[PDB]
Ligand SMILES: Nc1nc2c(ncn2[C@@H]2O[C@H](COP(=O)(O)OP(=O)(O)NP(=O)(O)O)[C@@H](O)[C@H]2O)c(=O)[nH]1
């Protein structure tokens with residue numbers, strides 16, 4: 008039924024474009040029309056909702072788009088609006104439970120997974136992103152990705168991925184899937200995280216087939232082709248393979264911890 012995700016990261020990393028790519032993926036039975044217009048810089052936090060379907064199963068997918076950070080001289084406390092929105096949904100869910108005349112089914116607007124966009128510098132994790140991820144992973148599931156990965160070669164993607172994984176362990180950033188016998192499947196996923204993804208809101212004719220891609224002066228970058236980028240790995244993780252596992256952790260771990268602290272401090 009319901010599933011909510013949110014894109015977070017530095018400004019100019021294709022977060023808004025990735026929102027359109029998730030809804031326009033050719034895996035679903037139908038897609039919204041092609042955009043064909045430059046998306047302006049996101050100034051306000053806003054959520055998009057649409058019902059997608061695959062294999063006859065409908066899903067009410069909600070994606071929250073956020074304004075990018077990291078453009079000021081001093082970016083201190085730039086995580087407050089995003090952390091505030093995450094806790095706002097936990098408070099809404101709690102107030103719906105304690106309502107004396109509460110409805111049968113509680114509307115769930117809690118963020119079930121956060122997609123964190125990392126700049127494709129090719130070096131290591133930035134101190135600004137380290138501070139952001141450490142605060143994020145305490146309250147929400149986080150899956151990091153290498154944004155606009157076509158700016159790096161395949162060799163550069165892998166070397167950058169390994170260096171990101173090194174300082175993730177060094178700074179104790181437990182991203183999803185957390186380490187807490189199917190370890191072989193999650194080890195394969197943790198090997199590829201952060202995914203090297205590419206966004207696209209346009210359809211192009213390549214090899215006689217209509218596919219999503221970015222048209223440049225040298226070729227078409229097919230975003231749903233594993234030979235070009237790893238967007239199918241992110242799409243299958245969020246929507247297909249680990250959808251319920253993300254919701255179970257959000258309700259039983261993250262929201263439960265928020266609810267316990269809220270009720271204990273009120274006696
Ligand atoms: N090379 C490349 N460019 C991309 C990709 N995705 C988006 N872009 C381009 O990058 C620019 C910024 O896109 P946008 O989605 O607005 O970024 P944003 O993170 O939403 N910015 P903001 O957070 O400030 O709103 C646009 O020109 C867009 O076409 C990608 O995968 N690769």
Ligand SMILES: [Mg+2]
Pocket residue numbers: 022023024047048049072073074075
């Ligand atoms: Mg944007």
